[PDB]
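Notes continue from the previous slide.

Worked example: a multi-chain complex. Inputs as given:
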Amino acid sequence: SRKTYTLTDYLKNTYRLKLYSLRWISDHEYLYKQENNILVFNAEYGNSSVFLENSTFDEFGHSINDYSISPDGQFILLEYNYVKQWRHSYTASYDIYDLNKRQLITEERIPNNTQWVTWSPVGHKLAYVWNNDIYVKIEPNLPSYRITWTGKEDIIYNGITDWVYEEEVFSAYSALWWSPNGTFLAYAQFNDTEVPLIEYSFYSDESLQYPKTVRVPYPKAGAVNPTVKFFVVNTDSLSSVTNATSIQITAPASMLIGDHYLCDVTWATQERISLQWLRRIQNYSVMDICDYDESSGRWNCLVARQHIEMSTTGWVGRFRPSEPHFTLDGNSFYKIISNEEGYRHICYFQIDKKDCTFITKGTWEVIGIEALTSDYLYYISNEYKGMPGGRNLYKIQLSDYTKVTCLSCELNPERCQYYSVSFSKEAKYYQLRCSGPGLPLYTLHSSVNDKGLRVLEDNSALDKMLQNVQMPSKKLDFIILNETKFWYQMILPPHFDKSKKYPLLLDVYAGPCSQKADTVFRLNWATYLASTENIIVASFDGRGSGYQGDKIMHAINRRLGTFEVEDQIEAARQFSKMGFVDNKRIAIWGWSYGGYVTSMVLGSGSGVFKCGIAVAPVSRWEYYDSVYTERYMGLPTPEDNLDHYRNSTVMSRAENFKQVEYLLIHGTADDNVHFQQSAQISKALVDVGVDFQAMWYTDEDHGIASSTAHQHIYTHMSHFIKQCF
Amino acid sequence: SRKTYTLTDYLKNTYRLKLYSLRWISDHEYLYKQENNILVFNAEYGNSSVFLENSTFDEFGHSINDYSISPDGQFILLEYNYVKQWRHSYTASYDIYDLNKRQLITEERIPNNTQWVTWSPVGHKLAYVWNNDIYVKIEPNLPSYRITWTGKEDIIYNGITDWVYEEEVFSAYSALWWSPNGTFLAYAQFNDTEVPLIEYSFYSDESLQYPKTVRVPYPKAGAVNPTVKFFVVNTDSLSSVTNATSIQITAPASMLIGDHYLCDVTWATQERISLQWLRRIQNYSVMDICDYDESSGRWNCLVARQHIEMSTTGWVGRFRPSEPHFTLDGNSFYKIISNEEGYRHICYFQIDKKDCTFITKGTWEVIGIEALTSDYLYYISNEYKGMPGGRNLYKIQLSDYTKVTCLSCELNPERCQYYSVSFSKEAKYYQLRCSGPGLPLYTLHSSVNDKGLRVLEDNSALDKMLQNVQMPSKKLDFIILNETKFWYQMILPPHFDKSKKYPLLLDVYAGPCSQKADTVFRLNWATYLASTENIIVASFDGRGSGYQGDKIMHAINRRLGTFEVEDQIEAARQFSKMGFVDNKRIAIWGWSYGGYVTSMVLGSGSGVFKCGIAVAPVSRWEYYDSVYTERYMGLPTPEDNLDHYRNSTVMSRAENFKQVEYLLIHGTADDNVHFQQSAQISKALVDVGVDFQAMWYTDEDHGIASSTAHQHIYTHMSHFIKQCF
Amino acid sequence: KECDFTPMLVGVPPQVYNFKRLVFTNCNYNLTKLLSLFMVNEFSCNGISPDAIARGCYSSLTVDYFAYPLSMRSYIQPGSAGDISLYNYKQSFANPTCRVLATAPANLTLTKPSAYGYFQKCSRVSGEHNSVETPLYINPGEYSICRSFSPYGFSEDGEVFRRQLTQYEGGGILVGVGAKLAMTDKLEMGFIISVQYGTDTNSVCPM
Ligand SMILES: *[C@@H]1O[C@H](CO)[C@@H](O[C@@H]2O[C@H](CO)[C@@H](O[C@@H]3O[C@H](CO)[C@@H](O)[C@H](O[C@H]4O[C@H](CO)[C@@H](O)[C@H](O)[C@@H]4O[C@H]4O[C@H](CO)[C@@H](O)[C@H](O)[C@@H]4O)[C@@H]3O)[C@H](O)[C@H]2NC(C)=O)[C@H](O)[C@H]1NC(C)=O
Ligand SMILES: *[C@@H]1O[C@H](CO[C@@H]2O[C@@H](C)[C@@H](O)[C@@H](O)[C@@H]2O)[C@@H](O[C@@H]2O[C@H](CO)[C@@H](O)[C@H](O)[C@H]2NC(C)=O)[C@H](O)[C@H]1NC(C)=O
Ligand SMILES: *[C@@H]1O[C@H](CO)[C@@H](O[C@@H]2O[C@H](CO)[C@@H](O)[C@H](O)[C@H]2NC(C)=O)[C@H](O)[C@H]1NC(C)=O
Ligand SMILES: *[C@@H]1O[C@H](CO)[C@@H](O[C@@H]2O[C@H](CO)[C@@H](O)[C@H](O)[C@H]2NC(C)=O)[C@H](O)[C@H]1NC(C)=O
Ligand SMILES: *[C@@H]1O[C@H](CO)[C@@H](O[C@@H]2O[C@H](CO)[C@@H](O)[C@H](O)[C@H]2NC(C)=O)[C@H](O)[C@H]1NC(C)=O
Ligand SMILES: *[C@@H]1O[C@H](CO)[C@@H](O[C@@H]2O[C@H](CO)[C@@H](O)[C@H](O)[C@H]2NC(C)=O)[C@H](O)[C@H]1NC(C)=O
Ligand SMILES: *[C@@H]1O[C@H](CO)[C@@H](O)[C@H](O)[C@H]1NC(C)=O
Ligand SMILES: *[C@@H]1O[C@H](CO)[C@@H](O)[C@H](O)[C@H]1NC(C)=O
Ligand SMILES: *[C@@H]1O[C@H](CO)[C@@H](O)[C@H](O)[C@H]1NC(C)=O
Ligand SMILES: *[C@@H]1O[C@H](CO)[C@@H](O)[C@H](O)[C@H]1NC(C)=O
Ligand SMILES: *[C@@H]1O[C@H](CO)[C@@H](O)[C@H](O)[C@H]1NC(C)=O
Ligand SMILES: *[C@@H]1O[C@H](CO)[C@@H](O)[C@H](O)[C@H]1NC(C)=O
Ligand SMILES: *[C@@H]1O[C@H](CO)[C@@H](O)[C@H](O)[C@H]1NC(C)=O
Ligand SMILES: *[C@@H]1O[C@H](CO)[C@@H](O)[C@H](O)[C@H]1NC(C)=O
Ligand SMILES: *[C@@H]1O[C@H](CO)[C@@H](O)[C@H](O)[C@H]1NC(C)=O
Ligand SMILES: *[C@@H]1O[C@H](CO)[C@@H](O)[C@H](O)[C@H]1NC(C)=O
């Protein structure tokens, strides 16, 4: 009778979720931005004041994209002329504004086309990267100093990462690390001389007569990989008369026999650093702790401080080895590792000894470590009610490990089950974020007695609007296979009835260490399908999924494309046994790795599914990058796992596609999963004679995030499902 | 009931048309291939003999693609290892077999990867091109001689054409011309030093890991064109001790003041040659006649022997200036030239005088000149019954121009209205080929008294097969617009009744100097649609069509996309008023240029059409080659025709596509109409928010001629038409 | 007196169409040493005996020199129709003259140029649609209009040049094409000596 969630509501963003983003600038105060005004809030009382007014922004003369404020509070950094590159990279222009004298600096400006810029932890020092070289400015007024002289385009990188390190190792563009009190600067250098190149065409605007080719250094499986070095420089001894000096730290002898990576960099104290190295065969890692010698001005790394992490059933860590959390004095640290039973918990180390002592145990996992004080440790786990999809905050006393307290278990049981936290400088105040089964909620608390101060956001405006709209519901449950529990989720249409029959659509990602069944509130394409078209949307977590144990996670080691494909089919059969699912109308779709699973399921010959959609899929594992593929599959070489590379190809199953419908979508300027992979799928289907549908998007990347392209793809997909059902 | 023509029959070639291909080797003998044997026939009596048996072929050990025989009948040339490059280009290996002493020559073999080989008109000389250089062999068993030393890949071409000359000017890959008795050899040279390059991607099978990039020199509208030179060499003075000497012939001074092309080369006598030149603005041409001086060894070209051809309404020639036909003494020639009324006829020239004298006149055009004898001249025209779609053979007496006789008009008034001819060496015998309304027929005739000797092929086998299959009929008629007649054709379903209503499909090319209404018998996709699906398929010739006069042909000069588009729309309105067409089901589709017209018709907003298909379309005239585009449009500059370049794009009509259904098909590796053009259409439609369908084919050229892709594309289009209706 | 023939043997020689002219008046000459210095492949005199011109008093003695290949000997003749006479250089028979074709022994102060060269064609274009095409022919003992461009030589054979003519010159567009020949082992030169002499004004006398 009333209105429902329509496709226009999803595409035009009629109903909005409103957030609360804050930046801690001290132990007591944080920053906020409201009506384009920056305000300073006192955490204890809620009093506020104006830090910067919007009238000053108007007189600058440009459009400001983002800002940064120095730790001391004397200068502000402005960013404009934003040009995007890859996922975490960009190019912009910067200006510096002085708050004390209320004016703009016009001497020794930061040059255009800058790649990165950062402040020091204390003071007002600057370090930026321009033309693949590093510069340091002690004062914003004074000229800059040059540190590196060997930068080159697409060959040598200083202070910034290449493709594989930005996408698969660091998940960031920066390769600069400041000392805790601003004395030293550490950076890494990458060399891409022998790495092959990938070429694709870019068409650009209508006025361009000749298309241009883009060349990117990209290593595929079994190719040549870049090399890495590490340097440390001292910024208090810089002089303009002579060039600066850098000291190199060498990898341990156990990693110099062959290829290796650099995983993590962390500062322990003012004169102590820690580095982690990983072999090309990603089941062996070594952590090194290094010190500074005043007599010689050199960094020494001795054998007795090294620690070794290895795995016999798979790879090290979830994606990469975890980071350590050092104490104030720097003689011990905490870290997350896997125990004998296969569950990840926190263990306590000493820099000299080899063994370490666990402090947590049980049939659950610890997601991360958030804060460390002199008496308590804060972490996030999924212990509560034995639900892997939940998240909660706990604290543990360092003197006695038996005393564990939950801080977010019982604040609001029916509304909130998924949590995140943000702490202050010395962990006196913290902010809790609840995505939750219900509406998001934001609150502020004090750590002295765990007392709730006030409420920052409740999303009361959205609740009033949604009372007039018919909305779906969410159900979370599990099934048992081989005496093992596997979890699933379902989105159900309004006024659900057990007697009636509904069509079913299956959403799959099924990547290693992934979770699709959780307790998060979302408004997306699935909401449209259930609310208006009365379609059930379901997801399933099977073998290869994470946050449940190493036995489940490591089941697909060296055997990608075998067990996760079969698990999805078995779940569909179980769903069909329930009374309310129609056997004739079942479909499947996915993105990226999900497209790979969707293609193999349709070509399996099971006869359970009818139609499917694949968006930017992977077809052959030799077309993907080395770091991701070799982690789970090994080298593509005859003496080590070459047969399985050939048996896991989508093109080998083209004949079975005659029994199902198929839709294929891919963007031409895609840089993560290249357009080559979809081109080879279509050629195989044409050779055998299968009828299918295809679609290409010009000058679109992996996400297809352009405003016009986003609306087009979802309208096209909606029509395909309606005719299939 | 009886069976009907099906899609499987068209794809698998169930019903075949038989041919009779012969090669004249003397004035009364020719060669034929029966059961992989070469036979010799005498035209006077019909006797037969064996020239080469199939056992010899099997002894070689390789698959032989084609054969050539020397004029003296002593050697045979064998070809294998065939690799195709462009429409008229390829590469292969060759061997020479001696017929008199019956063995294979194993000394001084022709190198692998040879580009072009040709025999001399008299004798057994050879000339071949390898690595862009010219070689000559006096005898098959002797070493070769080198003539050129400047050949280099993708820059300098000697003896062969580049992309633009091969596709748009010469329609051939060869650039070597022999003298009538083998004394001289003439060739052309091109540099492409400043011509831009076009780049696209090639994927090349599953085993390849990195895609390949293809670079081809390709001049677009307003870019830089190549340059041409002409040389003549003497083959009777070659020696091993010294390098050869080549004499250059320079273009006339009226052509050296700017850019120009070379369009025709012809030999007049043993020591006389004729060349034709064309300006970049293709409405001015010059013909030169040059002789040989024995005293100096040079070539002299006289100003008094030059002839000028101009056009005021448009360009010169149909596609390029026509070729001369010299007499025996070389002091006069015949040529086809448009007259004062705009109709093409024959002049008679004297090499020293400027004026013509026309020997034919009327409201019809002469198609071509076939043979010339000291008493009579033979040609093909469309005078009979005033039908522009017909062809017939005529003979004219040189002494008195009043006596004209038709040789194929009343041979069989039905079943044959379209003819072609092939003469012998001295024009003593000829073969007539009919592809008229009825099944093809081949006959042999004499020239002394014009009596039919025998029937070579009658396709009696196919007639019996088609007797039990329902087949469509064809109608040819005309309509009147603005007191002018325009011709059309219709394919009609079996048992046609004027009372009923049928859907209509319009097939469009509508290019300059093109004809889609004629009397030719075909078995194609249109036969399937009428026989099985009961659909009328129609074609219409409007303004811009050829073989009717310069008034109709030149109406689209400097205005492309204006008059030919509106003509197609008006034809559909006229078809609707006849009475047997359903107004609600009308569609249109086209190829190449037809795709351009189809897209412009759909975007006009007339509302007459419902759905349409465009395969490999042209989007913007600035993306296409210079020689073709500048012939009808001019340069793209503000001083000359730039406004109409911008107003004739498909991307400016994207908003009107919301009222129709659209299908877009293109090939990835297309070198003629690049994938860029279809990529820009998709981007424009996505920007305005229009829903459509698309399909790409991997590693397919302009024609999409691979067996697997040929069957796929015609199955996909059939589903689209059936769903639309 | 004491007229010097040193510039003839000093520096790089010029091309055929850019010939340099030296006039001698009231001076003593030594033709024997010049002829003996060069290896004379051909020595011909028209209207005067070779010994008479060597030991005969004259009024004005004019010598024009240029670099010319030995192979193309037949083109520089009193009767010829080659490209050398039509455009590049045409001999004059107004007064008796001698033509000398010799080779430098390479022991002198001569610098071998890059290559020989001459003009294949030189013409003028005008009309309604640039279609008149009137050729230009050089008068004897004169200069070619095409010589302004490419004064020293051609980079490659078959070069094409264009220039716009003024009202005084005649109007239209001038077009010309040049040729190139490879250099021989030793330098080859051509000398033309002509005298305009009066009986009572024989200022120049042999030494
Ligand atoms: C296919 O096309 C390409 C490109 O169009 C051709 O390559 C071009 O070749 C020409 C050769 O003429 C070349 O032009 C010369 O380039 C030289 C580079 O340094 C220039 O120095 C030179 O100028 C001199 O020569 C002119 C002609 O002689 C003179 O008129 C001019 O004043 C200059 O004079 C110098 O030389 C004389 C001696 O001759 C000396 O006394 C003077 O003091 C002075 O020093 C020409 O401009 C182009 O640059 C080339 N184009 C390029 C490389 O892009 C190619 O040749 C074509 N294919 C074939 C087979 O020919
Ligand atoms: C025949 O010519 C070749 C090539 O020389 C080039 O082309 C000629 C037409 C002319 O224009 C020459 O000036 C060009 O240089 C000669 O091969 C060259 O020989 C020289 C000397 O031995 C050597 O330095 C080069 O490297 C050679 N070039 C190549 C490409 O090999 C050949 O010697 C000539 N034949 C005779 C008999 O002289
Ligand atoms: C917000 O208000 C509180 C109390 O009104 C301020 O705290 C006082 O600050 C003044 C000067 O900063 C001190 O002299 C007082 O001793 C403070 N009193 C208390 C109880 O803390 C606070 O500074 C204000 N903050 C802002 C940002 O305006
Ligand atoms: C710092 O190092 C750079 C390069 O290592 C020095 O720059 C070089 O100086 C020498 C001597 O003048 C030049 O020959 C090089 O060409 C310079 N290289 C570059 C890349 O510019 C620079 O001189 C050093 N600074 C000081 C103070 O010595
Ligand atoms: C053509 O058919 C005739 C059969 O009569 C033969 O041709 C004869 O050839 C010989 C040899 O040159 C001549 O002397 C005869 O005069 C020819 N006969 C006639 C009637 O012209 C022969 O069998 C056949 N030849 C070929 C090449 O097929
Ligand atoms: C060939 O085409 C050109 C381009 O249209 C013609 O040049 C034009 O000629 C007319 C007549 O004098 C002038 O009014 C225009 O200004 C010219 N256009 C340009 C761009 O110069 C040329 O006349 C045509 N040739 C012939 C023989 O008609
Ligand atoms: C600028 O700040 C003032 C301060 O409250 C506010 O009232 C005003 O709305 C702001 N302007 C804009 C455009 O938001
Ligand atoms: C950045 O480019 C602008 C545009 O030319 C220029 O005005 C400005 O000075 C540049 N910035 C620097 C630091 O040179
Ligand atoms: C920063 O740390 C270094 C390392 O001990 C120390 O020497 C220096 O004095 C510190 N700076 C300040 C301002 O305390
Ligand atoms: C990068 O590597 C190449 C060889 O792979 C080496 O020659 C080069 O010196 C390296 N770059 C630097 C800055 O050392
Ligand atoms: C795992 O590490 C061990 C110890 O370094 C090594 O022997 C083994 O080969 C590694 N796994 C694989 C699959 O190579
Ligand atoms: C259960 O075990 C059987 C046989 O051991 C196996 O085929 C199947 O894949 C297993 N299923 C799961 C979910 O582990
Ligand atoms: C070879 O020629 C003979 C003689 O006519 C014929 O019978 C046979 O069929 C031919 N075979 C092939 C494979 O061409
Ligand atoms: C062509 O290639 C084959 C195979 O490599 C070789 O045997 C033959 O000699 C080649 N042809 C010539 C003329 O060298
Ligand atoms: C071929 O033509 C040339 C050119 O006139 C002539 O000299 C020669 O005699 C003719 N015949 C032969 C056999 O070369
Ligand atoms: C006939 O003339 C009218 C009047 O301008 C015009 O609109 C129409 O396009 C013409 N049709 C044809 C076929 O020439």
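Summary box: The pocket of ligand 4 is lined by residues A 149, 242-243 (CB under 6 Å). Chain B has three domains: 28-189, 370-458, 463-724.
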